[PDB]
Amino acid sequence: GFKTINSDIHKIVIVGGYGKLGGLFARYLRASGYPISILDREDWAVAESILANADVVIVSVPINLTLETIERLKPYLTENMLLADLTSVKREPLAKMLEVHTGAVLGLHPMFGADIASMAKQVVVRCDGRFPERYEWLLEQIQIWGAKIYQTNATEHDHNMTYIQALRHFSTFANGLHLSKQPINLANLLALSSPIYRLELAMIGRLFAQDAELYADIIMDKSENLAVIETLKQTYDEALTFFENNDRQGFIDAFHKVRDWFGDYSEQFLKESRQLLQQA
Amino acid sequence: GFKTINSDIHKIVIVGGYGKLGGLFARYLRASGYPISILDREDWAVAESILANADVVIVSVPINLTLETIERLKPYLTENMLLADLTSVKREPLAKMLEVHTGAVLGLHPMFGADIASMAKQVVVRCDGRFPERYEWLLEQIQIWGAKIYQTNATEHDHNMTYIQALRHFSTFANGLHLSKQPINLANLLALSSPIYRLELAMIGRLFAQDAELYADIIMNLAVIETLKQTYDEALTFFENNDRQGFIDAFHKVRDWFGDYSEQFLKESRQLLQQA
Ligand SMILES: NC(=O)c1ccc[n+]([C@@H]2O[C@H](COP(=O)([O-])OP(=O)(O)OC[C@H]3O[C@@H](n4cnc5c(N)ncnc54)[C@H](O)[C@@H]3O)[C@@H](O)[C@H]2O)c1
Ligand SMILES: NC(=O)c1ccc[n+]([C@@H]2O[C@H](COP(=O)([O-])OP(=O)(O)OC[C@H]3O[C@@H](n4cnc5c(N)ncnc54)[C@H](O)[C@@H]3O)[C@@H](O)[C@H]2O)c1
Ligand SMILES: N[C@@H](Cc1ccc(O)cc1)C(=O)O
Ligand SMILES: N[C@@H](Cc1ccc(O)cc1)C(=O)O
């Protein structure tokens, strides 16, 4: 149960609302006192009646269907409505929402999966479209759940996701792929693993419990993503050289330079990770 | 304070005892009622008196100095002593301990760093050298502190460390190296990061807070890192060829290799972060 920030909101439609993320937001919104209607894959025959008199429309469909879904909403949108999305990429969905709708437009990116037990300390990225004064209530509602909002423009958002998501999930993918080809039994590795070592494997394996299509569409979104993963391969080759050459001091010098780049974050991360495992 | 499993142990010598791991073991053993003498980098001129009447000698020096350090102990060792190590590699240190000492010999590998706040649920690998009946007390003592003992031979230990340590730390090293060359500011990435995404970066940056020498010696294994290089290529090909279904099919096959561990790891990681 959560405080209802805006009691003048009488109907919220979630497009893709039987999905994992859309469903999660539907639950949180219902628990905050807002009536929710769902428009999912088999409901378009009655889109007109589902969307009729909506105050808010939220789009949470597969990345590769998002832009066509936004266009499909066009005939049913009225100017008083808020149009928003939850998509992992922002530049193109935000531009498309602003093109199809003349009213308030808000881009969101929840930086978490649908398996969260609570919204406490989870981050949602805010990219303004139009009329932010009309949707302040929704940003405040999300914070009532305990989430934190961070604001960027949609282009900067996607630029940062190049590193945060495309690079990182590509890398984890390659690590899991590699492990899967090795002549080893995972349970044998786990028996020798203390908590930190178990967590090393968990951070790789947990990726594969999720939807392949999500990670495919994130990584494939733009040519900057291909470019950054091509450079990861070049760096892997550079790192390898130290071990082929048995150049222990070269490795150490590089390790020390990388520590200076992290700065005090290296020691903070060591501490945070230890505390995470100690409690648990 | 921990229960003293064996009250007949009157002197334990830790070679490398002012170090991070040696110092940690010295603190646990002192707290378990065992008198500790330290033999560190400067102390070899008085090694005769340090090692005199020792019941146990534990080696905890840099990996690259470990075998020559064991060799250097031979003149001060007597048959009744227990000789043991904490080294991250087991096959060469164990053999060299069996070579220079006629008495009880035990190989240990603590699977953790010195910054632990307790031994609860930490793993120590056990590789028997000689006369395990003589050192059961110490295996029990370590468990009194809350650690788990897992037993293997030194060859199988070393084989598993290829994957658990060499592979994983090399890959984390290459990822931090790569990140350090990107046109980004870490604080800015962190401000967009929910707890799971902060942990993605934490798991890389925390490597670099530790001793570069340790990871250099552990990694230097080459085969598995060279094959990782081959897998990076296969993975990249999906994105270069815009082969989405290929990627999805490969992702599904990896999930099947992890089996139910994928979902268990998703749950464990969620729980770890929610507790925080
Ligand atoms: N699950 C996550 O970790 C996560 C995290 C952040 C953002 N997102 C975003 O959520 C969206 C994907 O949703 P999900 O991850 O919950 O996956 P999902 O597959 O579980 O949900 C997607 C839903 O959209 C529905 N759908 C498909 N075509 C439709 C159509 N034409 N009209 C209406 N509904 C349609 C599906 O039936 C499904 O219920 C993407 O925008 C993605 O970037 C997901
Ligand atoms: N630190 C870890 O996370 C970790 C984990 C598991 C195992 N280990 C093992 O710990 C051992 C020691 O490393 P540490 O991590 O505590 O690093 P460290 O540098 O803190 O400790 C090494 C100690 O050995 C001393 N030393 C150097 N040369 C010596 C010599 N000739 N004779 C006696 N002492 C000497 C140093 O002065 C120092 O006090 C290695 O065998 C390593 O594999 C370390
Ligand atoms: N990467 C997150 C889930 C997620 C996926 C895609 C996103 O856009 C955001 C979050 C996790 O593994 O838990
Ligand atoms: N890898 C552990 C520390 C460690 C290092 C070497 C070892 O042999 C064992 C454990 C960590 O990052 O916390």
Author numbering:
A (entry chain B): 92 to 371
B (entry chain A): 92 to 311, 316 to 371
What does the report in the manuscript say about this coordinate set?
Chorismate mutase/prephenate dehydrogenase from Haemophilus influenzae Rd KW20 is a bifunctional enzyme that catalyzes the rearrangement of chorismate to prephenate and the NAD(P)+-dependent oxidative decarboxyl­ation of prephenate to 4-hydroxyphenylpyruvate in tyrosine biosynthesis. HinfPDH is a dimeric enzyme, with each monomer consisting of an N-terminal α/β dinucleotide-binding domain and a C-terminal α-helical dimerization domain. In the prephenate pathway, PDH enzymes catalyze the NAD(P)+-dependent oxidative decarboxylation of prephenate to 4-hydroxyphenyl­pyruvate (HPP), which is then converted to l-tyrosine by an aminotransferase.
In HinfPDH, tyrosine is bound directly at the catalytic site, suggesting that it acts as a competitive inhibitor. The His200 imidazole is hydrogen bonded to the 4′-OH of the bound tyrosine. Ser179 hydrogen bonds to both the ribose O atom of nicotinamide nucleoside and the 4′-OH of the bound tyrosine and is important for orientating prephenate and NAD+ for catalysis. The Arg297 guanadinium forms a pair of electrostatic interactions with the tyrosine carboxyl, which also interacts with Gln301 from the α8 helix. Compared with other TyrA enzymes, HinfPDH lacks an α–β structural motif between α2 and β2, the loop between β5 and β6 (Lβ5–β6) is much shorter, and an extra helix α12 is found at the C-terminus. An ionic network consisting of Arg297 (a key residue for tyrosine binding), a water molecule, Asp206 (from the loop between β5 and β6) and Arg365′ (from the additional C-terminal helix of the adjacent monomer) is observed that might be involved in gating the active site.
